[PDB]
Design a protein around this ligand. Structure first.
Ligand SMILES: CCCCCCCCCCCCCCCCCC(=O)OC[C@H](COP(=O)(O)OCCN)OC(=O)CCCCCCCCCCCCCCCCC
Ligand SMILES: CCCCCCCCCCCCCCCCCC(=O)OC[C@H](COP(=O)(O)OCCN)OC(=O)CCCCCCCCCCCCCCCCC
Ligand SMILES: *P(=O)(O)OCC(C)(C)[C@H](O)C(=O)NCCC(=O)NCCSC(=O)CCCCCCCCCCCCC
Ligand code: SF4
Ligand code: SF4
Lengths: 186, 115, 441, 238, 242, 185, 82, 81, 66
């Protein structure tokens, strides 16, 4: 059985005949009575723990006196801004692409005037109108942005190194065996 | 889903002013029909005439509203206040808090302190 | 706004977009046994809309002054004889305006409010608020704080389950397990009162780590308690799991299907009882959870009995996590090492100028949280506990909304209880594990 | 014994049972969805998305053929073509007939694919089954009655309803071969959306969603431009 | 005390000393860039499938928000409940935020979960004291009580809602206490009255008035502007020289 | 419900077992039914609890354990010379989460920055310890005392006269608690 | 019931109402609004008073139709209660 | 006001089985004289009483119904026309 | 208390004290004196006792208060 011995369980013990009696008449002689040990439990009291012994901990970079300006650890003021996309410049991102995947070259001058038009056409006509006049293949290129199928929403685990769905599996050991309607998962 | 309670009414918008007109009459009728039943539920020691007087005045304060979207908020509140009263969720202190059983002149207000 | 004054286009409604089922494959008029003739309108002659508004079912106020109410619930029950036809839970009797009071507090000043929502799970409530502010602060709390917060997170889970499971057994009529388990929780509030100065409202877990470091004897005493807590779980296991009166009071009671449990906003055991593998500490690991091994109890019948078996397994899994935290406890600070966020040590505040200025500003103005909003959720002992915090960029939150698991659960009460008897309602209040500090807020 | 899943056996998710026919049901559900999208313009990304996802998942379900399917489909054609009157919804109704205590079946068309939906009479114990499971419409109208009341009674049903044991002009429809429990797992490894019973319910909700999208006309231009200041918060100028 | 034979005193065990502690500095926002591209594509994809209703989307760290007009509540939440790539079958939460500077005061914020894809999403719409919002109780049984809380706390009607009444406030209560203009302590208070033998309501007096220390807020801005973290795939191209 | 991707291995439950497939003997199944066997085990487990030491302590002769960090009633403290440590910075008045502290100060006759008023509404306090956390000079502390229940609420409105008297009486523990708990602060 | 019986009680009730302009204007074919000077809410109270006196319930659909004394008399005869 | 009692069929049968066990008490105090011939009648009486009890168990007359069925639609695929 | 303990403590303290202790503590406790308050209260310790019972006070006043 998955019982540890009573002799390791840090509770007050029976002794002598009463130990023999109790192991004769209990259901599990390795079960403890729940009564803690006066010499071991909370001994010494925290009010007599020496103050000099505990040392308040400082980490090397943050707490150092010579290798940290505050501004290279000021992560609160380096907070991300929300990145907001509207229909006015989703039509734009469809018109000419993106700094990652541009659509046309936009070489030098005379490309800037096309750049503003992509934003201007988004502000004048939205996404539904944009897909209306380019037809259905522009809508098909929208799925091409995600490889042809619609994108999957992002999972929130990253326990495997990449943000994914956590893969629940049945635990190797089932605590209720199979006898009870509760199954164990990992 | 869970069952809506006894007087639960689905929240719907008034189609037109004729709709609102008929609903407000339905709500006023339903209140004054229930005044005898409110009196014995809440052991009101006043007569039912006073209770119906107060119902009339509550409706009269919204008399001069010419906006459908303000009336429908108002028709919502009365529906919930009616449902709340008839199911006996509120108690006598709440119903008596509703019955009150400012200075009338500048000079009266001045002499007593502001009011 | 202005257009609403006169009649205009009606705002579309869920009734409008209703669709007719296909008649070729439709089978049955009721795929759910929750609506299978165990509600209102299953008797009488006429409906209660016209000519039926003059009569009432036998209506009884189950609470607030009631033991099974466990506090401050006014559950208006309509009884057909001894059978429930309609259950209307009335809450707000412990509504104290916590979410409005938080708007006139600094972020530090609002943290004790979270101690008092699910007020058997204080340090877990503190954690979800501390993790939302830390996310809006864009700071990374040190490893020792993360291990203290996960260990006291599971000490809190055991404390909640002792109150939850054994209060539930007390309602069904079993008195003795309640008494045994309240010595164990009385043991565990020493660990609270030794790291904080309170048995209940610790105010310990705060944005940036924890308030103080654990005292030098605490880990040994937690391990000593841990060596005997298995026996405690087994002796309460010994009075209820096989008891035939326990099995026939809970098996087949409060049954919710997997697909309805999600649609009802159920989380935690209320969801895992229905067969769904879902744990917020498995799916969005927070603090040190992704550094420990534990199993996830999942039921198969979605009833009070499976939910009981899942919670008694979480006793054993919480004790398993606690042992790993004791073993993996690192050294280092328990507060993020930035005095612009967390208070400096009293030694430093009395010794150095920049420590005194920062101590003075953190306790008068508070720290400023960069503007934005966030939804942060954790696996609370009662389910997905969440908070929606809106930040001005100032030192007071613009909006603090608490997503309480029991608020979402008490709402599905009439769905799962209508058709059962009055004792079965008592059974379902305890399996659904309500504390009305979180329900009302 | 363990070759096939047992319909209605609990799956491990409460209220979710084993589907009596998961393969055909997904095809019926997918083809039915690919039919309703056609009332959406081709430039809708919603159409192209659902149209893309459904066809991708359709080809996977086809890839898992039950044993003997070709033999049964050749037989089952010779039944539908020879006795189309029996399985015609325009003749026997959408529910397969009126006698629930016998076997029933209609022929259904989706995208041009042909489906036959059957309703085997419910399996109940002999000792709690009255009149073979006949429907109880209550006592026949007796005494002095008007013609209209006799009409409302169901008097036209004497001349159209069938004694279930009367089977000469009809053929007993044998349904489609099913997927051996190994193939069910193999198919659902391809689809990757949980159990096949889960995949089915997501498919049928996907079918009902199309009607709501079509009505709303979700592919048309934005209704309400947000007014100035609507989505401003507490941001600091960059 | 009868001590167990194999349980030594655990305090009596010597701990090996720990001296210099090294701790790397981390921006907790850096882990969220590996799915920045993915959260922007999903938000963009929804913008294209439902352009009648979705006004904008924002991506902060791992949270994707979808901004919609109120007339599209039913179709958008129908799409997020039933689509294969959008199996958002819970409503985690429904709350409101009051912005009195905005004509439409109230921001209705819904939070959804997709346990299938381990994904969360936020949808935001707007209303005022007279504009109602379509209820989602037909798609989400669990949304019944959330919408009642918004109606009680802020005063937002939810057209189509069955049994829309107060859930948090006292029975006869008048006013919406999560509105910004609603005072913190309210307008009334109660006491038991000896002459009337009941609980009565009275105008609010306070033995000690609430002390608002908000005027002690910093005269200096303490957070700054932040940083931009938009990925290149959702920024416009730059015209290269010559 | 289940995670997206391949379904969990063996997530589908095995087919149900029939009545004649349950591999329990009739003699055992019927014996357990009629002999009330599982509930006799529960009866026995209570018996061995009956012969275990009780947990009970005899309050007030015995007291349960409290730590140096324990937060009880408030006390104002003095330096070893009898000078008040309080200097009227008002930090605790600011940080209070329940606005239970009201302080009025002036320059004292000798030009010292000292409080003229010092009140704690003990029926507004939440006993969080934030006020003693913030003190620059260790003036406001929460005593280890929890037994101070009163007949009226006026007895719970502490003025400076009551709070200094508390420190004057409780100083030996307040000092021993600060000594034992200071390095962790 | 009797037509004269179901009309005599109405005159006493209508005259008994506090703020009708004058008790003489009540006739068998008199209008509440045009003649008796009763606004919307006063008319709803009058049908409410009539229903209470006759111990009958007047439904919303036909309650609106009663804008004149004659309409009240015909409804009272039509409904079988007294 | 009138209140549903879901166990009143128990009260009716309780009425008659009391009369039945009372009619068996004189036999208990007269066995030495009743002997075999008197035993037979007592068994004939208890057998008829027991048949009516099997009637009450068989019909579920002593059952209070309370709580708060699988798919039967098989689709078939013939493919194209 | 239990018979071995109660007789052992009763033997040590005497019958007169046994009845006094049955009047205030209601228990039968034996231990060594550790000190006396300024109020006359008497404090004892016995580590050979159940946890949280190793320290106790003999209250000086009859109308004893914590
Ligand atoms: C002497 C030493 C013991 C001293 C102490 C006695 C125990 C005191 C305990 C407290 C009082 C008893 C409490 C009774 C609790 C049991 C109970 O009432 O549960 C009802 C239960 C429901 O049974 P049911 O649903 O119909 O069937 C399936 C059940 N899973 O019904 C049952 O579970 C069945 C209970 C059986 C009790 C019948 C009496 C047993 C005596 C033998 C009967 C002789 C006839 C059988 C002959 C043997 C045949 C092999
Ligand atoms: C072999 C002889 C038969 C022994 C009885 C077997 C039995 O226990 O059956 C009980 C019987 C079950 O009938 P049923 O409700 O149909 O079972 C579910 C399937 N339909 O239950 C019944 O409905 C039959 C009616 C009750 C019969 C029990 C007779 C007991 C009466 C006391 C006899 C001692 C004197
Ligand atoms: P006629 O053409 O004159 O029609 C009269 C009416 C009133 C219909 C007006 O002409 C009209 O259309 N005006 C605008 C609508 C209006 O008056 N108000 C909107 C209706 S809601 C409302 O008024 C609610 C009032 C308060 C709640 C109901 C009253 C009862 C409160 C509680 C009573 C006692 C409980 C203990
Ligand atoms: S913080 Fe301390 S020193 Fe400062 S005013 Fe308050 S009590 Fe006095
Ligand atoms: S401990 Fe009491 S007095 Fe001190 S800050 Fe907290 S509530 Fe205020």
């Amino acid at each position: 059985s998955n019982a540890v011995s009573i002799t390791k369980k840090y509770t007050v013990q029976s002794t002598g005949i009463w130990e023999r009696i109790r192991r004769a008449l209990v259901i599990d002689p390795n079960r403890s009575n729940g009564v803690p040990l006066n010499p071991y439990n909370r001994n010494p009291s925290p009010g007599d723990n020496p103050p000099l012994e505990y040392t308040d901990p400082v980490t090397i970079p943050a707490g150092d006196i010579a290798d940290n300006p505050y501004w290279k650890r000021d992560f609160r003021r380096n907070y991300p801004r929300p990145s907001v996309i509207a229909q006015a410049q989703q039509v734009a991102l469809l018109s000419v692409g993106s700094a990652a995947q541009p659509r046309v070259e936009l070489i030098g001058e005379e490309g800037t005037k096309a750049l503003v038009a992509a934003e201007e056409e988004g502000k004048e006509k939205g996404v539904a109108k944009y897909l209306e006049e380019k037809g259905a293949e522009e809508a098909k290129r929208v799925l091409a942005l995600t490889g042809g199928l619609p994108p999957t929403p992002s999972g929130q685990t990253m326990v495997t190194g990449q943000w994914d769905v956590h893969k629940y599996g049945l635990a190797e050991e089932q605590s209720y065996g199979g006898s009870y309607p509760c199954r164990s998962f990992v | 889903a869970v069952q809506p309670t006894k007087f639960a009414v689905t929240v719907r918008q008034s189609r037109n002013w004729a709709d609102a007109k008929q609903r407000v009459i339905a709500a006023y009728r339903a209140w004054i029909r229930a005044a005898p039943e409110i009196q014995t539920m809440y052991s009101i020691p006043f007569p039912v005439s006073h209770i119906r007087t107060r119902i009339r005045q509550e409706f009269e304060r919204h008399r001069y509203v010419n906006k459908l979207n303000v009336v429908d908020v108002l028709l919502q509140q009365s529906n919930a206040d009616f449902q709340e009263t008839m199911n006996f969720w509120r108690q006598q202190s709440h119903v008596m808090a509703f019955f009150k059983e400012l200075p009338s002149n500048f000079i009266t207000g001045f002499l007593e302190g502001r009011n | 706004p202005q257009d609403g004054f006169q009649g205009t286009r009606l705002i579309p409604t869920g009734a409008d977009f209703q669709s007719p089922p296909d008649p070729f494959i439709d089978e049955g008029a009721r795929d759910n046994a929750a609506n299978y003739g165990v509600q209102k309108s299953r008797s009488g002659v006429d409906e209660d809309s016209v000519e039926g508004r003059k009569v009432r079912h036998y209506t009884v106020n189950f609470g607030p002054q009631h033991p099974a109410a466990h506090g401050v619930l006014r559950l208006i029950l309509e009884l057909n004889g001894e059978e429930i036809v309609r259950a209307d839970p009335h809450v707000g009797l412990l509504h104290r305006g916590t979410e409005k009071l938080c708007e006139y507090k600094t972020y530090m000043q609002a943290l004790p409010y979270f101690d008092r929502l699910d007020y058997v799970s204080m340090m877990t409530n503190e954690q979800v608020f501390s993790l939302a502010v830390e996310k809006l602060l864009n700071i990374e709390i040190p490893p020792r704080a993360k291990f203290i917060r996960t260990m006291f997170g599971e000490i809190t889970r055991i404390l909640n389950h002792l109150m939850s499971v054994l209060s539930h057994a007390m309602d069904v009529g079993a008195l003795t397990p309640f008494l045994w388990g309240f010595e164990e929780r009385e043991k565990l509030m020493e660990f609270y009162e030794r790291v904080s100065g309170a048995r209940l409202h610790a105010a310990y877990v705060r944005p940036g780590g924890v308030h103080q470091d654990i005292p030098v004897g605490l880990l040994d005493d937690i391990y000593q308690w841990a060596t005997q807590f298995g026996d405690r779980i087994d002796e309460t296991e010994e009075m209820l799991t096989d008891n035939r009166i326990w099995i026939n009071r809970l098996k087949g009671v409060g049954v919710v299907s997997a697909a309805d449990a999600l649609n009802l906003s159920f989380t935690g055991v209320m969801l895992r009882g229905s067969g769904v593998p879902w744990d917020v500490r498995k799916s969005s690991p927070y603090d040190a959870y992704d550094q420990v091994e534990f199993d996830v109890p999942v039921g198969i019948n979605g009833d009070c009995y499976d939910r009981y078996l899942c919670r008694m397994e979480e006793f054993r899994q919480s004790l398993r996590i606690i042992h790993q935290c004791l073993n993996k406890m690192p050294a280092g600070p328990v507060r993020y090492e930035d005095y612009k966020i967390t208070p400096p040590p009293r030694a430093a505040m009395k010794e150095n100028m920049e420590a005194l200025i920062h101590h003075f500003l953190l306790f008068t103005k508070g720290y400023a949280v960069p503007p934005g909003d966030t939804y942060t959720a954790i696996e609370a002992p009662k389910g997905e506990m969440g908070v929606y915090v809106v930040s001005d960029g100032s030192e007071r939150p613009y909006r603090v909304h608490i997503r309480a698991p029991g608020f979402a659960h008490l709402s599905g009460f009439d769905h799962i209880t209508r058709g059962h008897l009055l004792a079965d309602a008592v059974a379902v209040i305890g399996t659904m594990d309500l504390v009305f500090g979180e329900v009302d807020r | 014994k363990g070759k096939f899943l047992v319909p209605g056996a609990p799956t491990g998710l409460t209220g979710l049972g084993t589907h009596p026919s998961p393969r055909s049901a997904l095809l019926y559900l997918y083809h039915s969805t690919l039919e309703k999208l056609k009332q959406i313009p081709e430039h809708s990304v919603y159409r192209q998305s659902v149209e893309a996802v459904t066809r991708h998942r359709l080809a996977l379900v086809e890839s898992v053929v039950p044993e003997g399917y070709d033999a049964w489909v050749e037989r089952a054609k010779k039944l539908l073509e020879e006795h189309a009157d029996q399985f015609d919804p325009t003749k026997v109704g959408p529910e397969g007939g009126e006698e629930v205590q016998g076997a029933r079946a209609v022929k259904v068309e989706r995208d041009g694919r042909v489906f036959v939906v059957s309703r085997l009479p419910k399996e109940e114990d002999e000792r709690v089954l009255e009149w073979d499971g006949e429907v109880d419409e209550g006592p026949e109208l007796e005494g002095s009655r008007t013609l209209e009341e006799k009409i409302e009674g169901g008097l036209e049903k004497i001349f159209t309803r069938r004694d279930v044991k009367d089977t000469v002009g009809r053929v007993e429809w044998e349904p489609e071969p099913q997927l051996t429990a190994e193939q069910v797992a193999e198919l659902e490894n391809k689809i990757g959306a949980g159990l096949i019973e889960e995949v089915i319910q997501v498919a049928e909700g996907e079918l009902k969603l199309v009607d709501t999208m079509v009505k709303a006309r979700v592919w048309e231009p934005l209704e309400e431009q947000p007014r100035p200041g609507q989505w401003e918060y507490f941001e600091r100028k960059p | 005390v009868a001590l167990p034979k194999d349980a030594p005193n655990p305090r009596a065990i010597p701990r090996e000393p720990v001296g210099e502690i090294k701790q790397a500095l981390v921006n907790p926002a850096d882990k969220y860039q590996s799915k920045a591209d993915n959260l922007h594509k999903y938000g963009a994809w929804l913008m294209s499938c439902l352009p009648k209703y979705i006004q904008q989307f924002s991506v902060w760290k791992d949270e994707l928000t979808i901004y919609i007009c109120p007339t599209g509540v039913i179709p958008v939440f129908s799409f997020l409940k039933y689509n294969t790539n959008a199996e958002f079958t819970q409503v985690s939460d429904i709350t409101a935020v009051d912005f009195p500077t905005r004509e439409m005061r109230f921001e209705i914020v819904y939070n959804l979960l997709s346990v299938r894809h381990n994904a969360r999403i936020r949808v935001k719409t707007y209303a005022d004291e007279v504009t109602p919002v379509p209820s989602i109780t037909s798609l989400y049984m669990g949304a019944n009580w959330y919408e009642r809380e918004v109606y009680d706390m802020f005063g937002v009607l939810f057209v189509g809602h069955p049994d829309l009444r107060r859930i948090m406030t006292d029975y006869g209560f008048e006013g919406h206490p999560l509105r910004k203009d609603f005072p913190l302590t309210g307008y009334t208070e109660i006491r038991y009255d000896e002459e009337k033998k009941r609980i009565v309501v009275e105008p609010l007096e306070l033995t000690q008035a609430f002390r608002n220390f908000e005027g002690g807020s910093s005269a200096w801005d303490q957070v700054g502007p932040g940083i931009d973290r938009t990925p290149d795939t959702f920024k416009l191209p730059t015209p290269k020289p010559e | 419900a289940t995670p997206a991707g391949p379904p969990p291995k063996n997530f589908r439950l095995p087919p149900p077992k029939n009545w004649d497939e349950e591999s329990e003997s009739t003699i055992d199944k019927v014996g357990k039914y009629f002999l009330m066997t599982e509930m006799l085990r529960g009866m026995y487990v209570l018996l061995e609890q009956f012969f275990r030491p009780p947990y009970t302590i005899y309050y007030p002769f015995e007291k349960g354990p409290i730590s140096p960090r324990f937060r009880g009633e408030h006390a104002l403290r003095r330096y070893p010379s009898g000078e008040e440590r309080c200097i009227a910075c008002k930090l605790c008045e600011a940080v209070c989460p329940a606005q239970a502290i009201t302080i009025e100060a002036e320059e004292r006759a000798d030009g010292s920055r000292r409080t003229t008023r010092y009140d704690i509404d003990m029926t507004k306090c939440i006993y969080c310890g934030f006020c003693q956390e913030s003190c620059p000079v260790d003036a406001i502390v929460e005593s280890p005392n929890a037994e101070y229940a009163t007949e009226t609420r006026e007895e719970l409105l502490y003025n400076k006269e009551k709070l200094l008297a508390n420190g004057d009486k409780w100083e030996p523990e307040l000092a021993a608690a600060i000594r034992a708990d200071a390095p962790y602060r | 019931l009797q037509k004269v019986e179901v009309y005599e009680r109405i005159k006493s009730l209508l005259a008994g109402f506090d703020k009708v302009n004058d008790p003489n204007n009540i006739t068998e074919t008199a209008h509440f609004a045009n003649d008796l000077g009763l606004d919307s809410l006063d008319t709803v109270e009058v049908v409410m008073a009539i229903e209470e006196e006759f111990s009958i319930e007047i439904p919303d659909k036909d309650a609106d139709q009663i804008h004149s004394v004659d309409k009240a008399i015909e409804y009272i005869l039509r409904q079988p209660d007294a | 006001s009138p209140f549903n009692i879901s166990f009143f069929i128990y009260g009716l049968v309780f009425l008659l089985l009391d009369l039945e066990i009372l009619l068996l008490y004189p036999f208990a105090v007269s066995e030495y004289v009743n002997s075999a011939y008197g035993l037979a009648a007592a068994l004939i009486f208890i057998g008829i009483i027991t048949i009516g009890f099997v009637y009450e168990l068989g019909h579920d007359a002593l059952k209070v119904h309370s709580r708060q069925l699988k798919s039967s639609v098989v689709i078939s695929y013939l493919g194209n026309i | 208390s239990y018979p071995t303990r109660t007789l052992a403590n009763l033997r040590k303290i005497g019958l007169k004290e046994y009845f006094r202790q049955l009047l205030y503590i209601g228990d039968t406790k034996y231990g060594e004196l550790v000190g006396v308050d300024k109020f006359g209260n008497k404090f004892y310790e016995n580590k050979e006792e159940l946890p949280l019972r190793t320290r106790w006070v003999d209250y000086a006043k009859h109308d004893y208060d914590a």
